[PDB]
Amino acid sequence: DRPRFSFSIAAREGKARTGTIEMKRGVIRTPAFMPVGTAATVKALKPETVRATGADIILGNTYHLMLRPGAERIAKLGGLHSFMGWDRPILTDSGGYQVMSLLTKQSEEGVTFKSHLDGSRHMLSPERSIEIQHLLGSDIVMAFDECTPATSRAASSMERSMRWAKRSRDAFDSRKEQAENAALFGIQQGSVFENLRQQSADALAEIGFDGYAVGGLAVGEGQDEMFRVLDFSVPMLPDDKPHYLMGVGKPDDIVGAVERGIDMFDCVLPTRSGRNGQAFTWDGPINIRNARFSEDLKPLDSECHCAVCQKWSRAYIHHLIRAGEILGAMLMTEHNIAFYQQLMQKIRDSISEGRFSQFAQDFRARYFA
Amino acid sequence: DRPRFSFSIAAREGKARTGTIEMKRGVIRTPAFMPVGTAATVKALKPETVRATGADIILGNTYHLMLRPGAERIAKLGGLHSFMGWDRPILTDSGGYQVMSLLTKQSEEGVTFKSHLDGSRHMLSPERSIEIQHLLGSDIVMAFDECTPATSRAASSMERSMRWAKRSRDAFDSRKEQAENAALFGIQQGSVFENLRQQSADALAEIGFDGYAVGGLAVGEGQDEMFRVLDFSVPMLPDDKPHYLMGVGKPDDIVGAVERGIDMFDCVLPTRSGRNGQAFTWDGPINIRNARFSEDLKPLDSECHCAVCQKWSRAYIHHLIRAGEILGAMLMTEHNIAFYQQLMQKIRDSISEGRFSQFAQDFRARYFA
Numbered sequence A, B: 001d002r003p004r005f006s007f008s009i010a011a012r013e014g015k016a017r018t019g020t021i022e023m024k025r026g027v028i029r030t031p032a033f034m035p036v037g038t039a040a041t042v043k044a045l046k047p048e049t050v051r052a053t054g055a056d057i058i059l060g061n062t063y064h065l066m067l068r069p070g071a072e073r074i075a076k077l078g079g080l081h082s083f084m085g086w087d088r089p090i091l092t093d094s095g096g097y098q099v100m101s102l103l104t105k106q107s108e109e110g111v112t113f114k115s116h117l118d119g120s121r122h123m124l125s126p127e128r129s130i131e132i133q134h135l136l137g138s139d140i141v142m143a144f145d146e147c148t149p150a151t152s153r154a155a156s157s158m159e160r161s162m163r164w165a166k167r168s169r170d171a172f173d174s175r176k177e178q179a180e181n182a183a184l185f186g187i188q189q190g191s192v193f194e195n196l197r198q199q200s201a202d203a204l205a206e207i208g209f210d211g212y213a214v215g216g217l218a219v220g221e222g223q224d225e226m227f228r229v230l231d232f233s234v235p236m237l238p239d240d241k242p243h244y245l246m247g248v249g250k251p252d253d254i255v256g257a258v259e260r261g262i263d264m265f266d267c268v269l270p271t272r273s274g275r276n277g278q279a280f281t282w283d284g285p286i287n288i289r290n291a292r293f294s295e296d297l298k299p300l301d302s303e304c305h306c307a308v309c310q311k312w313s314r315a316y317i318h319h320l321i322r323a324g325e326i327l328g329a330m331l332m333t334e335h336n337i338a339f340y341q342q343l344m345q346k347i348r349d350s351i352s353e354g355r356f357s358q359f360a361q362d363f364r365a366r367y368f369a
């Protein structure tokens, strides 16, 4: 048998850490990047291709799947893993952020809202969110939080989220199958305010979670501000548990966040911007639709080990994306997700060899040249 | 070394034949179905996936590739095979039909036309079409024909096409690299008129080609009429060369056309209707968007050996197509192309075992139940 959840730090450099999370469905190498699979698919990739790029875990969403195709329906069909054909760990967001981003009525009990898809009306609460995530069969369950710049007011939302974090913990612990086979993460709130971040961290650590996410970022704050908040926020979290930065981000954001103690990441940038023609390279991103690539026989990136860069030219991918061909989206997406995973591998290896500081400097010098 | 073009008939049953075409880039099992790759991609499939389904040869188009990305450009980038990553045979249509279907001025010299894409003006002729197909590096080159129901008038178009067939032959034979490494097929015209089909067949056989296509069908004539035309048209063609029915078709069309002596087929139905939610099965086509499939855990087809049917349920593919997800198009397309190839395999095996008559009866009884 394998453990439910065991995080082990193998090496450190400054605030950066590298290690593993062992879970029943597999091992997660940290720092980790999670491709986003909101609609029970990582867009334009088979799950075998997601795995081939190096991903150990993907992200799903309570909000989208409760609406389409439905949580109880996925459970009847055998759970999210069987449904989409990914047999490794899945982390699910709780719905707190997506309900706010995508027609809502807030209270201490929870949120009622109108779906952006049907106009149908629905409810979420800590207890319903945890139940939905159980029905999906998520391996890492997120606590349900209230999400809203803010006064002052940020403290009201943070304090409610901490009350909801306790209800999430209790709902999770009441479901034996969940508590024995899954892990539960809390979400730190408090916006840009050091004192509220501390109050939030204290509340979560008093409750106790398997891991701690940093919420309230990647919402348009600029990298300077995000780094400032991480500087004081991450040290407040339990050192011996994973630290998950929700929604981040660009390669340069990921590197700086690892320098500040983050272990886990998710964002739509590699998939969405790949479909839109943006390819990541070690010399910075390029827009493959640009006419300069029409006769370029080189691969998207000259060092990348992915299957796309072993077989097809920039010129061919340029043609596909210009033509609106599905294979264009497929190849751009595979390459970008592989690039993100190779970035994470380089981060892990450099921390384990005690040269991550030098890697970060070298990476930024070339990427921004 | 391998032969330029060697067709060998291994078994016959009635007018049906099964065998092989050996070419420098591989062997083509007949009767053969060619997936369509008009824009230098079989839509939503990597070439390795096209091959995995059983395809021996794919179809490309002079008309689309001369416009985007351009014939001379593809040649500079190393040819169509290298460009799209398919290293097996490619048959290219000559442009005669697509120029008519997709703003044109006809003459004995050729056709000038306005592109449906740019509005730019272009010319095609027998000599330019053959040159374009040389630049692409096509393995089976189609003669350039004039295409237009018709009086009477059908005879005018047919006779010009026969003059253009001779010019196509001469242009091909003037290009040593082409004549040594590629094959050339002629196109029989004459519409529904037995006497014109005979005049056309005579003209083509006097010129001499590696294979003979039956043109002027799959243009909305109904299956009864198509079969009537094949009944008298295919016997007019040289028995010892392949017979190619352009643009056909539905599974039931393919079976009946093999019964009448056709060896080669192409159509967009499995790819295009797959993206639109139609899946082929041995019990007939189904529309996977229908609500009856929302909780159906069976595969698309209960006997199909394709990778899609080994891993994912109807319910999951239903969800993907309803959501507009790219993976939906990918999986539907792989399954439909695999189904077509399994149909062709069953046809070949039954002819080689002398039970094709029984297969056709059994196939129709189940498919149309």
Ligand SMILES: CC#C[C@H]1NC(N)=Nc2cc3[nH]c(NC)nc3cc21
Binding pocket: A093, A094, A095, A096, A097, A098, A142, A145, A146, A147, A148, A187, A189, A214, A215, A216, A217, A218, A219, A246, A247, A248
């Ligand atoms: C306050 C707060 C907060 C966090 N709460 C929940 N439940 N999910 C998140 C997802 C995020 N995605 C992005 N940017 C794309 N920032 C996020 C923040 C959260």
Ligand SMILES: CC#C[C@H]1NC(N)=Nc2cc3[nH]c(NC)nc3cc21
Binding pocket: B093, B094, B095, B096, B097, B098, B142, B145, B146, B147, B148, B187, B189, B214, B215, B216, B217, B218, B219, B246, B247, B248
């Ligand atoms: C008269 C005539 C004729 C043939 N001539 C050339 N060059 N290409 C063809 C392609 C076809 N596609 C379909 N149906 C989709 N019928 C076709 C017929 C032709």
Ligand SMILES: [Zn+2]
Binding pocket: A300, A301, A304, A305, A306, A307, A308, A309, A310, A335, A336, A338, A339
């Ligand atoms: Zn790559």
Ligand SMILES: [Zn+2]
Binding pocket: B300, B301, B304, B305, B306, B307, B308, B309, B310, B335, B336, B338, B339
């Ligand atoms: Zn199948």
